[PDB]
Structures are given as structure tokens and as C-alpha cells.
Design a binder for this molecule. Structure first.
Ligand code: HEM
Ligand SMILES: Nc1cc(Br)cc2[nH]ncc12
Length: 370
């Protein structure tokens, strides 16, 4: 997978993110690295105000611009959401909202934190000679002490890596189909299935490393955005950049390129529908890189691997391809069992509309089994 920026190890995730910035930018990174101690102690929406309009010009290699977008990113979430209890800033200062929106529009992205910012870039290996697990990794950044953003981004990150096992497989699937190689292809769809059958046991650590209460009450509030949120019905001013408030999505895994690519591949049309479910995940393609866009693009340009299985009436492929769509339902049936532990049960101590979405989606998967 050429200039699609796909790692043959961590896939869509960014490989060995930058842990540190240039020195030209050290009063960014000092906020960013003491956001709990500072939000709490109130001087954060006093310390932010008192900064000056830096310029992107210095940021050279990728990882820099990216980590830079992470840093600006969460600082915006602390400034806007405050202590995370309802005193909401509807104005992002001239001075923080101009290098953030340049650094963003440099990377064809929107000025707000995303999936690729705070799961795909926000990580480091504790020892860069052992392997990528929970016990040998740590996040760069967090919002408040005891929010578990270790558990969230790390577990969430770990999975996207278990799907990468199957991304290096896509190249060979369509090869088999073209050169017509019934055998070769049946394999690729079983490897592809084999991975997501495992990216499930990944998901299980969530229960070891996150707390229902902490995720519903703490994290979530800082991840929200200003699109259809009612605390900022009109959006968020971006000072000396848009005199008009600008709505933007919260941060969702609806911005992840794996899953979205495996629906593309497996002929499951989650984008097509006009329904709320499918309108969203199309408008989240925006909140994804460009290079991870143009890969879901070149997939959808590909001949439906579903059709080519239906035809052949070859109960082998018929079965192997169902293994992949069995795999994907399996996972979103878990991802609903977590959401009831981690958003519904606590909310009883917006709501539903979230689960309908997540079911609307489990379903459209199912209805592609042969
Ligand atoms: C406590 C943990 C989690 C909670 C509360 C949660 C909740 C949600 C919610 C409410 C949505 C709907 C979009 C939104 O409202 O933002 C969503 C979408 C999504 N989540 Fe999760 N999730 C969790 C863990 C994970 C993990 C570990 C993964 C994968 C690594 C994941 C992958 C996704 C994906 C891919 C979507 C969008 C695709 C779709 O709609 O099927 N989530 N999640
Ligand atoms: N809303 C979300 C934000 C982030 Br980052 C990751 C996620 N996983 N599942 C949901 C969700």
C-alpha cells in the first residue's frame, strides 16, 4: 500500500509518534503536559488567554505537524469545555485559534481534535525494543486525572492495530479476483476474517483499564464538539480566522479508517442510505487525514468482492466471505455491550439515538451475509 501512508505494522496508526516538539513552541507543550493540574486549579482559562500568535513555518517533518495538531487539539478542548461542567467558552482566542487553523488546513483537516489526533498519534512504547501492548505503551496526553484516556485511547489504539494485520491482505484479494485464482482468494478472506476474530479479545482489556462512571462523566465531555451540541448551538468562534462561528463534529471512532475500509471491501454499503447512520460516517470521512481518505476512495473504485462471490456459487468463498461479515457483526455486538455498560447504565445515575445509530449499523452489516 504505496503513499496511502499505511504501516505494514500498525496500519492506519502513526508509527512512533513524535514525543516532543521543537523548542520554538514550548509554552504550547507545557499546557498540553499539565492539563489536569491546570484545568482543576482554574488558571487554565487564565493561562491560555496569555499566549502569542506563533507561526507554523518552523514545523517541518510530518510527525511534528501532527503532534502539534494533537497539542493544539486537546488545549482547545480544555479551553472550550473548561472543568467539564457547563461553563463553556464560545470563543477561542485570536492567538491560539489562528496557528491551530493554519496547522489544520495545512493537513486538509478540520480545526478540532479527531481520532487520528488522539488515538493514532497520542502514543508511545514504554520500551522501544519490547512489543506494542498495554503494559509497554502509554499515552502522551490526558484531560483530567482519573479519566482513563490511557484505557480509552490505548485499548482503542490496540484494536486498530489488530485490524492492520488484514490491511496488507487487501492488495492480494483483488489480485486473486482479477487473475482469477479461486484458491488464493479464499485464503485472503480467511486471513482477513482471522484478524477481526482477534481484534475482539483486544476489546476485552477495556474492562481491566476503564471505569463506566469515569468514561461517561469525565472523558466524553472533553471529546464533544460543537455540531448539534446545544451548549454551543451556533458553533465556536475561531478568532481572527472565521468571524462566523464554525460547527464541527466531536471526535468519534466514526473517523477510523479500518472498519470503514472493511465495510468498503466487504461490499457492505454503510455510506449509501441517506439515513442518519450513513449520512454521518460519510461526513466523518472529512475528519480523517487525506491519505487515509484517498485509500477508501481507491477501494470503492474496486469491483465489489461481494458480487464476485455471489456469482461463483462456490460454497467455499460463500463461507469465507461470510466469516468476515460474521467477524464484523461479532465486534459491533460487543461494541453495543460496552456502550450499555459505559454510557446507558451510568446515564441513569443525547442517549438512545446513539444506540439506534449503532444498531442501524450492526444490521446493515448482517444483511450482507449470503
Ligand atoms: C468505553 C468505550 C467505548 C464507548 C463508550 C464507545 C461508544 C461509541 C459511540 C456512542 C459511538 C457512536 C459515535 C459517537 O456517538 O461518538 C461509537 C462509534 C464507534 N466506535 Fe465506539 N465506543 C467505545 C469503544 C470503542 C473501541 C474500543 C472501538 C474500536 C477500537 C470503537 C470503535 C468505534 C467505531 C469504529 C465507531 C464508528 C463505526 C460504527 O458506527 O460502527 N469504540 N462508539
Ligand atoms: N466518540 C469516540 C471517540 C473516540 Br477518540 C473513540 C471512540 N471509540 N468509540 C467511540 C469513540
Amino acid at each position: 500500500s504505496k503513499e496511502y501512508h499505511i504501516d505494514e505494522e500498525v496500519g492506519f496508526a502513526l508509527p512512533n509518534p513524535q514525543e516532543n516538539l521543537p523548542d520554538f513552541y514550548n509554552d504550547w507543550m507545557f499546557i498540553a503536559k499539565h492539563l489536569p493540574d491546570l484545568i482543576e486549579s482554574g488558571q487554565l482559562r487564565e493561562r491560555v488567554e496569555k499566549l502569542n500568535m506563533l507561526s507554523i513555518d518552523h514545523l517541518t517533518d510530518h510527525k511534528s505537524q501532527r503532534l502539534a495538531r494533537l497539542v493544539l487539539g486537546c488545549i482547545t478542548m480544555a479551553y472550550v469545555w473548561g472543568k467539564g461542567h457547563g461553563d463553556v467558552r464560545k470563543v477561542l482566542p485570536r492567538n491560539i485559534a489562528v496557528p491551530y487553523c493554519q496547522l489544520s488546513k495545512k493537513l486538509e483537516l478540520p480545526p478540532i481534535l479527531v481520532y487520528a489526533d488522539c488515538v493514532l498519534a497520542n502514543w508511545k512504547k514504554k520500551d522501544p525494543n519490547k512489543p506494542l501492548t498495554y503494559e509497554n505503551m502509554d499515552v502522551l496526553f490526558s484531560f483530567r486525572d482519573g479519566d482513563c484516556s490511557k484505557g480509552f485511547f490505548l485499548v482503542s489504539l490496540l484494536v486498530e492495530i489488530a485490524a492492520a494485520s488484514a490491511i496488507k491482505v487487501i492488495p492480494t484479494v483483488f489480485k486473486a479476483m482479477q487473475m482469477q485464482e479461486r484458491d488464493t482468494l479464499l485464503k485472503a478472506l480467511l486471513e482477513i476474517a482471522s484478524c477481526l476474530e482477534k481484534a475482539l479479545q483486544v476489546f476485552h482489556q477495556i474492562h481491566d483499564h476503564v471505569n463506566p462512571k469515569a468514561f461517561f462523566s469525565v472523558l466524553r465531555i472533553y471529546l464533544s464538539g460543537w455540531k448539534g451540541n446545544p451548549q454551543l448551538s451556533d458553533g465556536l468562534v475561531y478568532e481572527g480566522f472565521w468571524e462566523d462561528p464554525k460547527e464541527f463534529a466531536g471526535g468519534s471512532a466514526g473517523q477510523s479508517s479500518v472498519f470503514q475500509c472493511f465495510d468498503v471491501l466487504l461490499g457492505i454499503q454503510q455510506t449509501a442510505g441517506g439515513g442518519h447512520a450513513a449520512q454521518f460516517l460519510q461526513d466523518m470521512r472529512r475528519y480523517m487525514p487525506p491519505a487515509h481518505r484517498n485509500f477508501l476512495c481507491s477501494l470503492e473504485s474496486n469491483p465489489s468482492v461481494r458480487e464476485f462471490v455471489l456469482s461463483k456459487g462456490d460454497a467455499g468463498l460463500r463461507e469465507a466471505y461470510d466469516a468476515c461479515v460474521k467477524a464484523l457483526v461479532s465486534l459491533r455486538s460487543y461494541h453495543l455491550q460496552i456502550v450499555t455498560k459505559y454510557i446507558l447504565i451510568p446515564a441513569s445515575q443525547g442517549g438512545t439515538d446513539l444506540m439506534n445509530f449503532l444498531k442501524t449499523v450492526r444490521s446493515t452489516t448482517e444483511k450482507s451475509l449470503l
